From a paper:
Recently, we identified and described a quinone reductase 2 (QR2) pathway in the brain, in which QR2 acts as a removable memory constraint and metabolic buffer within neurons. QR2 becomes overexpressed with age, and it is possibly a novel contributing factor to age-related metabolic stress and cognitive deficit. QR2 is a metabolic buffer, which becomes a metabolic stressor with age or when given certain substrates. We therefore created highly specific QR2 inhibitors (QR2is) to enable evaluation of chronic QR2 inhibition as a means to reduce biological age–related metabolic stress and cognitive decline.
Numbering used by the authors:
A (entry chain B), B (entry chain A): 2 to 230
Write the structure that this text describes.
């Protein structure tokens, strides 16, 4: 009954592997009757930089600019830039937020980092107190769907890149858990560039098939032991 | 001596703690006779988005855009955007790259993430087979000088945030080591916002004193065991 999904999507090319993973999610969730929204960050020319442009209205201290203080105040005063509040609107309504992106330097692309920096402000995504399990986005699900250049075998404890879960720590725990999300297990599509046509189609099909039962899943325990132990 | 240092600086406020840490490195390295350059990312309005605007002229394949391929070919063909090539010139000349930034979501601010995404391109910072110990920036040193909101206690293995080394893994290993940097021990100034006047000046003094002997330091073993063991 009216599950709402937000897909935050960070890829330049609609014919890319990320584009196909994004479209398959839109197709499959919509076929299920879910309500679906996509934030196509590149197509929006989404602003990634945390600057004083993000507050309209009088600054709590215009001689020494403190981004975290001013955007907290602006959030309560409703003087944040509208591109920020447009994203907060999509997030607040969502029951599940999916992040769809290629791994860039063991992390999200900078345009998606900027979305996190600027949308998840204090007052909206967390408060003091009110973080981790008491984060303000508690009750919501989050899911990282990431594609990588390296193979699965390279992302093992003994491979050169370390285990794949090591690079999920800042995103799943430092960010989503901190904000109160429960985190579903990541969807990692390893190395589509060198995968064969069969394997690429398989990776695409596993994502589609997993989405059919997405609402029946349990979140991971987002702990240091899950990531490192 | 005749050593060259590049500081890549990502803070909006000159009077900030990050700003003082940057000014102290300029003063201290300049006093020692070193050659100093600063990339003030916010002052430059540095572009964080990886887009087809990063290639000048016309594209290898304009109908399907692949950022990694196109920037690789653009670097070899000397047709990257000039803001990227300006930064690569400073890096190529530098014997040490210091990054000075507040921790944002267990990572770098998006404007600094964009620097990494766009400047450290294939053929410049790494290639096949040159990566990790044989990355193209071998011979150079790199150093993360990061400030946090959370205290040192919180960033322990059993505290709420986990070991601070957990979030250094994407930056130190996945990025800097991958490109061939030897990584100096991070400089972490924990929680200057809640620290007293005395501890804040002690944190600034530790940094200023460390810069007296920066060229004597041996790099860390940038391994998974250093980060998680
Ligand atoms: C700045 C930067 C930093 C990076 N850092 C890292 C890093 O730290 N670690 C790492 O591992 N990698 C890294 N990479 C590599 C990056 O993660 C991969 O290149 C990216 O994940 C690949 O997915 P894609 O959608 O871009 O590729 P695409 O090239 O778009 O997809 C690959 C092949 O996809 C086929 N495809 C598309 N749709 C379908 C379909 N429906 N069915 C079958 N085939 C299809 C494409 O047409 C093509 O055949 C980095 C890349 C860049 C640019
Ligand atoms: C978007 C966002 C995401 C964040 N994510 C995280 C996170 O994941 N984890 C985390 O721990 N924190 C996080 N933070 C908090 C952030 O890391 C800290 O607020 C930042 O590191 C503080 O350093 P600063 O330079 O901004 O502080 P400032 O406020 O500039 O410095 C603090 C106090 O510094 C005094 N000061 C300046 N110079 C001197 C001097 N020379 N001598 C003595 N005192 C001086 C200032 O005037 C002031 O009194 C986040 C913040 C934001 C905005
Ligand atoms: C471990 C790792 C880290 C970074 C990147 C990386 C960074 N990039 C920046 C711009 C463009 C590209 C294509 C890019 N790839 C790749 C791997 S990787 O796992 O895919 N790596 C394994 C060894 N051979 C090279 C490929
Ligand atoms: C672990 C963690 C993660 C994120 C942030 C964080 C995100 N932010 C977004 C906008 C503005 C601010 C000031 C901000 N802080 C802080 C901590 S933290 O370590 O500083 N944490 C310690 C316990 N009290 C709460 C703060
Ligand atoms: Zn967690
Ligand atoms: Zn390493």
């Amino acid at each position: 009954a009216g599950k709402k999904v937000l897909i935050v999507y960070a890829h330049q090319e609609p014919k890319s592997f990320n584009g196909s993973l994004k479209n398959v999610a839109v197709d499959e969730l919509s076929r299920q009757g879910c309500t679906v929204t996509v934030s196509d960050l590149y197509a929006m020319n989404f602003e990634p930089r945390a600057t004083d442009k993000d507050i309209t209205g009088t600054l709590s201290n215009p001689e020494v600019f403190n981004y975290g203080v001013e955007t907290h105040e602006a959030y309560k005063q409703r003087s944040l830039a509208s591109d920020i509040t447009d994203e907060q609107k999509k997030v607040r309504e969502a029951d599940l937020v999916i992040f769809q992106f290629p791994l860039y330097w063991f992390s999200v692309p900078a345009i998606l980092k900027g979305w996190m920096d600027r949308v998840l402000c204090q007052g909206f995504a967390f408060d003091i107190p009110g973080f981790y399990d008491s984060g303000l986005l508690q009750g919501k699900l989050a899911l990282l769907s990431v594609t990588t250049g390296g193979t699965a075998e390279m992302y093992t404890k003994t491979g050169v890149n370390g285990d794949s879960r090591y690079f999920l720590w800042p995103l799943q725990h430092g960010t989503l858990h901190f904000c109160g999300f429960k985190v579903l297990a990541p969807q990692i599509s390893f190395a589509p560039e060198i995968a064969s046509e069969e394997e690429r189609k398989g990776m695409v099909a596993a994502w589609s098939q997993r989405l059919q039962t997405i609402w029946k899943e349990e979140p991971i325990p987002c702990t240091a032991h899950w990531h490192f132990g």
